[PDB]
C-alpha cells in the first residue's frame, strides 16, 4: 500500500510501479522532470516528490483520479503551468505544499482549486498570495513564511482557519489616510455594466461574454460597502487583526501584535468617507 | 437642463435644450441635421402636438423628467408632397431578451 | 450579433488580409470595410472554445515580416536611388503601421496588453504568461520588423548614401532636404515605442559615424583654411562655416544632436587651433581691430580656455594705455588732466567692451584691475600722488575761480569723478586731504553753493559708507548751525537785562573739535586787542549758559576783520587778519614803535610776528625807521605818511594757497598713524571673533576688511601684531610660535 | 582812539571739558569698540577715560595703570 | 453630420449623437480616424451592423451622460442598466472600450 524511494538506485529507471500501492513518496533524487510513467498510475492518494531537480510541472494530468495530497516541496519549480490548473485535479485535491521552492507568483487559476484544506508555500519568493484566495473556502492550513508578502489580498478576510504561519515577511506599513486614487468619474460603463452584471447575479459564461471580460468579472473586487467594482477603485493598505481570520496566529518578535496588511478596495469616492469616519471613530 | 431624443421613423437625434429653449431652436437643429426646411415638421409629445411659439418649459420637460441619462421622447413627422404630414410611425427599439 | 461564436480562420482572414494589405501600402479603402474589419478582428479575438488571438497575432506578424522583406528586396534591386525609395516606402509603411494600430486596437489593448504580465500584478495566468519572443503592439511590431528587416540589413548602405549627400551639401551643392530628413529621423521614429533610450538606435546608426565624419571633414577644412589665408579671414570663414553648419544641423538632423555636431565642429577648427588664435589676438586688441576682436570673442567663448588669455591681454593693453595717458601731463593742471585722462580711458574701453565684446563681466573685471593699477601708479622711491590729485581736482571744481560755470555741469563732472575715486586704493589719504581743503573752503567761503557740498558728502557716503565722511558731515553740520547761533547770539543781545554795545559787527563760526582738520598753534599766548574781550566774554557766558560742561577755544590764525581809513585823505577798506589788526591797533597809538613794544602789546611770539610784519611790508602799508635790510629785534616801524592802492577796497590777508610740502608730510604722518590704529582695531575685532586663529588667517582677514579704505602693507601689519602683543591683550601660543591666544 | 574796527569774523572751536591709555585714542573722540552713548569718566586720580574702555578694563583689574592705585569714578561727563 | 456622428445599428436605426460624445469610446475614435482623406461632406455613417439597436440606444445615452456629467462636482447618479440588457451592453462596452 505504501512505498518510498530515497535514492537513484531504488528508483526503477524503466519498469513501472505496482498497483497495490496507495501512497507514493519519492525523496532525494535527481529527477530533472516528472516522468510520464508515474502520471499513468490509477490510485495515487498522496504524491510526494520532495527534494528533486524538477523545473516544469507536467502540462496535463495523465490518468490520476484521486491525487488527494500532492507534495512538491524543496523543488526547483518556477511557475505552475496554466493548463495544469484547468484539469480535474481541483475536484479531488486536499493539500499542496511548495516549501523551499523558486516559485515567485502563484497563478490566479489556483482559485478554481476549491478543494484544498491545507496549503504550504514556505521559503518561496511569492510577491503576494493569489487574490481570489477567498474562493478556497475549505482551506484550513496556510503557510507562506520567509516570503515577501507586502500585502495580503482583499478576499483574505473571508477564509476561516485554525493556524497561520506568516512571520518573516516584509509587512508594508498601513496607510489608511493616504489613498491611491485610481477611481474615475464618470464611471466608464464597463465598470457600470460590470458592476451591474454582478449586482443582478446574471449567470454568464465564456460562451456568452467575450473571454477576456470573462476573466475580469471572475475576480472582480468586492468593496466593503457590499457592491462589486471591476475597476475604478480606491486601494487602501489597512492593517487588520488576523485572529478573526484564523484561530491561532504565529508571528516573530512581536508580543500582543498580530496586525496584518490587507488591500481594501473601495467602489466610489463617497463610499470611502464612510470608512474614514469609521476608522477615525475607532 | 434637459436632453431630447427625437425619434423620426428609423432615426434618432440627441439634442440638448434648456427649459427656456424655444421649439424653433429644435426645429432648426433638425433642419441642420436632416438638410430639410424647418417649417415642414411638427414636434410631438405622446400624440400631443407642440406649436412653434410656446417653449418647452410649459410642456412638462422638467429636469426631473428628461435627464441626460434617460432623455424624453419627442416625435417628429416630415412633409409629404403638398400640405400633408405623415403620422407618428415611430419604430420601437428592439426587444431585449 | 455580439456573441462568442465559432469562427473559421481562413474565411475572415482573407478579407482581413485584403484590408491590411490595402492599409499598410496606402491605397483606396472603404469606411464600411474598415468597420467590418473591426467587427472581424473582435470576432477572431474572442471565441469558444477556440480563441484566435494567438493565431491572428502570429499570422499578422508573418504577413508584416513578408511585406518588410519584399520592400527590402525591392529597394535593394534598385541602387543609386536607395534613399528616395527607402523614404517613400518608409512613410507609406509607418502610416500603415499607425493604421494597423488603430485597426488592431482591440488586439493591442485586450490581448497583447494582457499577456505581457511579468510579476504578480493581480493577473497571473489568463493568457500567454510563458513568454518567449515577447509580444509587442502591432503599431510597435511593424516598426520593429521594419528596423530588423529593412534598416539593419541596409545600415551600412544607408550611411554611405546619407554621408554622401550631407557632405555634398557641405561642398556647395543642394540635396533635397525632405528625403534626407525623413531617412535620418526614421531611426528616431522606429524606436518611438522604446521606454528607455529612444535615441539610442539613432545615436548608434547616424550620430557617432556622422560625428566622426564631420570631425574629419572639418579637420581637413581647417587645415586648408590655415594653409591658404591669415588669421582675420580665417575667423571670418570659421564663423561662416559654423553658421552654415548650425543651419544644416537644423535642416537634417534630430534636434537632440544640434549641440553635439557643433561641439565637434568648433573644436576641430577653433579648439584645435586656439594656440594659433591666442598667438595673434595680442596684435588684434592692441590695434584698431573691432570686427577682429568681436570674431575672436565669438570663437573663444565657445571653447573652455579661449577667454582667459584674451582677458589678460586686454588687461595688459588697458594698463599700458592708462600708464601712457597719465604720464604726459602738463605741470599747470595735474588734477583735471589726470581725472579727464582716466575718464577718457575708462569711457573708451567700456565702449569697447559693451560694443565689441558684448559687455562680458570678465572683461569688465580686467578693465577695473587695469585702471586700478593705472590710478595707483606710484613712481619708484615715492608715495602715491593720486589722492592728492583727486582732492585738488574736487577743490578746484568747488573753487570760485571757475567764472561763468553753472552747477549742472558741476554735478556732471562731480559724478564722473566718482568713477575715478572708486579706483583709489588709499582712500584715507584722499579723505584727509579733502577734509583739510574743504575746511579751508568753508572758513574762507570760496564755494559755489552749499548744495555742492550736499552733493559731495552724499556721493562720498554712497561710494564708501556713512562713517567714511561722517566727520565731514559733522563739520558740515557745524556750518548749518553756526549762523543759527549767530542769530541766537543776536537774540541774547536783545535778551540781556543790561544792554551793551559791542562796537563791532561780530560774526562767528562755531566748530566742533576733533572732527575738524584744524590744528591749534601750541601756546601762542596771543594778546587779544582791547576791543574784542567784551565780545569774547559775552560769547563765553552765552555758550556756558546754553551749553553745559563744554569749553571753547579761540583760534586766532583764521579770525579776520575790517579796518577802514577815512579821517586821512585816503579812504581805504582793508580786510585784515587778527594779528595784523592787533599790530595796526598798536601802531595807531604812537608814530614810532619798536619791536619790543610789539612783544609787549601782542604777546605773540617772534616767528609769527615777523611773518606778519613781512606780510605787512610786502604791500607797503608801513615804513621802516631802520636802514637795515633785515627785521631784527631792534627794528622800529612807523605808519605810512604817503600810502596808496589801485584796489581801494583791498585786503592785506594772505590769500589761501596750496598746502605747503611740509604740511603734506604731516598730513601723511597723521594718515599713517590713523592706519596703524585702524589695523589694531581690526586685529582686536578678529581676535574677539575667533580667540584662536592662524597668523595667515589674521593677515587675510585684516587685508580683506581693510581694503575698502586703504591697502596696508603687510609689514605695518606685523608691527601692529607686536604692538598688540606688547599690550598683553593676546599671547603667542606656547606650542606654536605662529599661533595666538586670548588671555586678556 | 579815533580809528576803530567795523567787522570781525571770529572762528571758534568747541569740545568737551588728551590720549587714552587704554584704547590709545583721543578722549573726546570715539573709542575703538564704539555708539553715541560713549561718554567720558573722570576719576579721583585726575584721569579722564572713555566709559567703554574703563568699563571693560575694570571687569578684571580694579586699579589704575597710571599710578597703580584703585580707580574710583569721581564723576561722569556725557 | 461632420459635427453629428450617425451610428447605424443592426436593425437599421440611425442614432445621431454629438461627435464629442461619440469620441468617449476610443474604438469609435479609431473607427472615424481610419482610412483618412475624408471628403468632409458632413456624412459620418458608422455601420455597427453587428450590435443590436436597443443597446446602441443605451450606448448613445451613456455617451451623453458621460460628456455632460464629466468635470462636475454635483451629485452624479448611477447610470441605469436594465437586468435584461446588461450583458449586451457589457460586450458592447467591450467592443466600444468605454
Ligand atoms: Zn463601496
Ligand atoms: Zn565707547
Ligand atoms: Zn590713575
Ligand atoms: Zn578709550
Numbering used by the authors:
A (entry chain L): 134 to 415
B (entry chain B): 2 to 98
C (entry chain A): 2 to 745
D (entry chain R): 20 to 36, 40 to 56, 65 to 108
E (entry chain C): 15 to 112
Quote the study's own text:
When vertebrate replisomes from neighboring origins converge, the Mcm7 subunit of the replicative helicase, CMG, is ubiquitylated by the E3 ubiquitin ligase, CRL2Lrr1. CRL2Lrr1 has five subunits: a Cul2 scaffold, a RING domain-containing Rbx1 subunit that catalyzes ubiquitin transfer, a heterodimeric adaptor formed by Elongins B and C (EloBC), and a putative substrate-recognition subunit, Lrr1, that is linked to Cul2 via EloBC. Our structure, coupled with bioinformatic analysis, revealed that X. laevis Lrr1 has four major domains: an N-terminal PH domain predicted by AlphaFold, a central LRR domain, a VHL box and a C-terminal treble cleft zinc finger.
Using 3D classification, we identified multiple classes in which the Cul2 WHB domain and the Rbx1 RING domain adopt different conformations relative to one another. We focused our refinement on two classes that represent the extremes of the motion. State 1 represents a conformation in which the Cul2 WHB domain and the RING domain of Rbx1 are closely packed together and have reasonably well-resolved density. The close packing of these domains would sterically hinder the addition of a ubiquitin-like moiety called NEDD8 to the K689 residue of the Cul2 WHB domain. Neddylation stimulates E3 ubiquitin ligase activity and is necessary for CMG disassembly in Xenopus egg extracts. The RING domain of Rbx1 and the last domain of Cul2, a WHB domain, are tethered to the side of Cul2. The N-terminus of Rbx1 contributes a central β-strand to the β-sheet of the Cul2 α/β-domain, explaining why these two proteins exist as an obligate complex. The nominal resolution of the best-resolved map is 3.1 Å.
